[PDB]
């Protein structure tokens, strides 16, 4: 639908329903600026079925640290309020769309 | 306090962290707990074993594992122990203090016998002095 943004508790408020792709990015790494356009390229293709959400892991890293994410990029695939796939490394557009399409 | 957890975070954890936890425990006694990880860590480069043998410390028994939040977020202190970005650019959650103390990687020496030993030796002297300072300051 859009690249939504989350924080300390708004993660859960955005992921408890539907199928949702949470992503974790910050200035620390190069992939932070490659996964980002890949996610916008994902939303404009299949955001009709999928929500995407981001945590900035310097401004809003509390959710990441709480879950035990500490690493860039990181991706938590959720549906109906639980994780169903996990990724802790960069993926191109086609591979990232496949990663969520497995459970969407 | 009997036990204070401190962490090294370094590319591959192959060498510098193995060396640094060896250096650590000769000045940071049982009062401290010292752990090490990195991007795809699980290895013990013989260069670090040699680097500790230069100062009469054995590390041949040591191990490593990938980054593990169950212990890193429980630490007081994360030493970034590289001047490198292949380490999955970790973002070290605000439960823990961070600083960078490494600046080079002896696993990336030019590869001649002389440059290999020179790279180990410079980083070995640096890491040893730095861990000795950390024991004096408590950072």
Curated annotation (Swiss-Prot), chain A:
Keyword annotations of the record: Disulfide bond, Electron transport, Redox-active center, Transport
GO molecular function: protein-disulfide reductase activity
Disulfide bonds: 29-32
Keyword Cell membrane assigned: no
Matches recorded under InterPro entries: Thioredoxin, Thioredoxin-like_sf, Thioredoxin_CS, Thioredoxin_domain
CDD domains: TRX_family
Gene Ontology annotations for the cellular component aspect, listed alphabetically: cytoplasm; cytosol
GO BP: cell redox homeostasis
Thioredoxin domain span: 2-104
Pfam name, any one: Thioredoxin
Similarity section: Belongs to the thioredoxin family.
Function: Participates in various redox reactions through the reversible oxidation of its active center dithiol to a disulfide and catalyzes dithiol-disulfide exchange reactions.
Protein name as it appears in the record: Thioredoxin
Gene that encodes it: trxA
Swiss-Prot record, chain B:
Protein name per Swiss-Prot or TrEMBL: Arsenate reductase
EC number: 1.20.4.4
Expression induction or repression: Induced by arsenate, arsenite, and antimonite.
Phenotype of gene-disrupted mutants: Mutant is sensitive to arsenate but is still resistant to arsenite.
Biological role: Catalyzes the reduction of arsenate [As(V)] to arsenite [As(III)]. In vitro, can dephosphorylate para-nitrophenyl phosphate (pNPP).
Gene3D superfamilies per record: 3.40.50.2300
Predominant location: cytoplasm
Record's subcellular location: Cytoplasm
GO cellular component: cytoplasm
Residues the record marks as active site: 10, 82, 89
SUPFAM superfamilies found in the cross-reference section: Phosphotyrosine protein phosphatases I (SSF52788)
Enzymatic class: oxidoreductase
Species of the source: Bacillus subtilis (strain 168)
Family that this chain belongs to: Belongs to the low molecular weight phosphotyrosine protein phosphatase family. Thioredoxin-coupled ArsC subfamily.
Cystine bridges: 10-82, 82-89
């Amino acid at each position: 639908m859009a690249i939504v943004k989350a924080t300390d508790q708004s993660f859960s408020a955005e992921t408890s329903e539907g199928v949702v792709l949470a992503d974790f990015w910050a200035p620390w790494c190069g992939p932070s600026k490659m996964i980002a356009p890949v996610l916008e390229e994902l939303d404009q293709e299949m955001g009709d079925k999928l929500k995407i959400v981001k945590i900035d892991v310097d401004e809003n890293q509390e959710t990441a640290g709480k879950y035990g994410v500490m690493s860039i990029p990181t991706l938590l695939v959720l549906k109906d309020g639980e994780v169903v796939e996990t990724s802790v490394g960069f993926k191109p557009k086609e591979a990232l769309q496949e990663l969520v399409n497995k459970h969407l | 306090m009997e036990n204070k957890i401190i962490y090294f975070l370094s590319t591959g954890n192959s060498a510098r962290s193995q060396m640094a936890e060896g250096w650590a425990k000769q000045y940071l006694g049982d009062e401290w707990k010292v752990y090490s990880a990195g991007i795809e860590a699980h290895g013990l480069n013989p260069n670090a074993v040699k680097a500790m043998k230069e100062v009469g410390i054995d590390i041949s028994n040591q191990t490593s594992d990938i980054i593990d939040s169950d212990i890193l977020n429980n630490a007081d202190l994360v030493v970034t122990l590289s001047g490198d970005a292949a380490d999955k650019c970790p973002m070290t959650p605000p439960h823990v203090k961070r600083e960078h103390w490494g600046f080079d990687d002896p696993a990336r020496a030019q590869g001649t016998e002389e440059e290999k030993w020179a790279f180990f030796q410079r980083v070995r002297d640096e890491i040893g002095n730095r861990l000795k300072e950390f024991a004096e300051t408590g950072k």
